[PDB]
Target: Porphobilinogen deaminase
Amino acid sequence: TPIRIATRQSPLALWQANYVKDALMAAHPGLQVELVTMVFVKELEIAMLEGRADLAVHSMKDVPVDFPDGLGLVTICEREDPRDAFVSNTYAKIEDLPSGAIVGTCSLRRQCQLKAARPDLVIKELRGNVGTRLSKLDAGEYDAIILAAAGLKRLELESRIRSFIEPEQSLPAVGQGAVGIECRVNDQRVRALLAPLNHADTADRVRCERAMNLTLQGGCQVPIGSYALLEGDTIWLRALVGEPDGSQIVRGEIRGPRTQAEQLGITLAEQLLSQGAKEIL
Ligand SMILES: *Cc1[nH]c(Cc2[nH]cc(CCC(=O)O)c2CC(=O)O)c(CCC(=O)O)c1CC(=O)O
Ligand SMILES: [Mg+2]
Model:
């Protein structure tokens, strides 16, 4: 019987769903995979619980803090470009923006980092899908907008990237550029098929980034950057918590043994909490 992938109708969701689908068929010759369109990720998980679906593809940023009984995140694929992208028709990068320029972003994480470096900037809300966001930019509603580099590259929109904002300039959200896969824990047929898609290097990084995030707070509603490289077998984790208006920014660093990756994040988060990260709310 065909393996079903629960996915939204959005271009990004459809791409990620097809990515795993193709990856599955490449690793397992003769395997049948099909996509089930749906309609707040709860609806996706219910379908898997109701046996209307097998696995679901998520961006690691959008993976919830709590998994319903019977489910969980068992796989993390090879990571794409983790950092933010600067998108403007009239400008190249951040420092080329005039004082009081209008930069659309709905992300508390991206906003707090911009106001920190340049408080002068006027930050306006940005909503809609990827195409809708670009549509507003061409309408002159913004001087510039900031989108994830991964999303644009996967949509072949890569020409819309004027400059790559480095992790130093803007710290990526937890698991940004990383694609995770969720399924039924006790489904061994699926667990065994999703095993080759798992990237060990990427896995330890994101699972380290998560533990840091989880300790502080959940979801994307909170202005928290979480990003980790790995140098050889050593994991370098950087975390960020700050005021949305760019008042104060609390940064931290730690360097890992590869095995303690989950323990690193929870310790660094506790380290920041003692440094005033708790008072930020
Ligand atoms: C977690 C929250 N979701 C949104 C939009 C979002 N989520 C995932 C992606 C793709 C990147 C990836 O695959 O890792 C995107 C698109 C994007 O532009 O990042 C974002 C907020 C975007 C916004 O315009 O506000 C994040 C919030 C965050 O990153 O802080
Ligand atoms: Mg989209």
